[PDB]
Amino acid sequence: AMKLYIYDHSPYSLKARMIFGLKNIPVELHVLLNDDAETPTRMVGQKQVPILQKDDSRYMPESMDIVHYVDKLDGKPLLTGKRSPAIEEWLRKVNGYANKLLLPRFAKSAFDEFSTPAARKYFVDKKEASAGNFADLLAHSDGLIKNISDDLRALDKLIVKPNAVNGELSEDDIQLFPLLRNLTLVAGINWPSRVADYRDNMAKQTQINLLSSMAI
């Protein structure tokens, strides 16, 4: 009877979703409108998402707390591999700018949490620094796309396996995949073959759709 309250686009929700998919544990997704402060506050006392409702019907926020709690539910935790400092550095870098590519694309996209005009507007009112700034960021796609492409060629030589970035499923797979999955929203990226393998493989494994059809 486990429910998971999420936003489709958010990495933090995706991290929670991965652990259910990877362990083949059935979960009832409930996407909440981006502007909804009242419902998550009933559940956990604050506007926080993702939220997990366990079988006892009690609520629990925080992505990593949820991942750790779920990995444990069947007595066979899967996230046993080592973390790579080379992967953590790469993540640190790309996260310094990926949102310059994603946030504007998010706002324009077909996600449930934006299904209402006011829900979509809130996201923009919360994330867009100045009134037309997303339009200016989109206009600098050319530059950012080169930047991301180059980085993916560096991530390419680092990926040991298509089913575990380090060779054994680890926290790096939790931190990496959401980023990669969401970057498939960005039209024009050049994807190297091993990164591509990993992206496709890890999507079938986590039971999470990729965004290529909505790419802009």
The one-letter amino acid at 10: S
Distance CA 166, CA 146 (A): 25
Which segments within the chain are labelled E, that is strand? 3-6, 28-31, 51-53, 59-60
Distance CA 119, CA 112 (A): 9
Residue pair 30/4 in contact (Cβ under 8 Å)? The answer is yes
Distance CA 133, CA 138 (A): 9
- Whose tokens are 């059935």? That residue is 26
Which residue ranges does the chain devote to CATH 1.20.1050.10? 91-216
Resolution expressed in Å: 2.4
Residue pair 214/8 in contact (Cβ under 8 Å)? The answer is no
CA dihedral 16, 21, 23, 29 (to 10 degrees): 60
The one-letter amino acid at 154: A
The technique by which this structure was obtained is: X-ray
Which of the four CATH numbers 3.30.428.10, 3.40.30.10, 3.40.50.720, 3.30.450.20 does domain 9-86 have?
3.40.30.10
Distance CA 151, CA 140 (A): 17
Residue 20 parent element (H or E): helix 11-22
Residue pair 73/26 in contact (Cβ under 8 Å)? The answer is no
Residue pair 185/214 in contact (Cβ under 8 Å)? The answer is yes
Question: What is the CATH class of 91-216?
Answer: mainly alpha
DSSP string, 134-182: HHHHHHTHHHHHHHHHHHHHHHHTT--BTTBTTSS--HHHHHHHHHHHH
| Count of CB atoms situated within 10 Å of the CB of 120 | 20
Which residue ranges does the chain devote to CATH 3.40.30.10? 9-86
Distance CA 188, CA 198 (A): 19
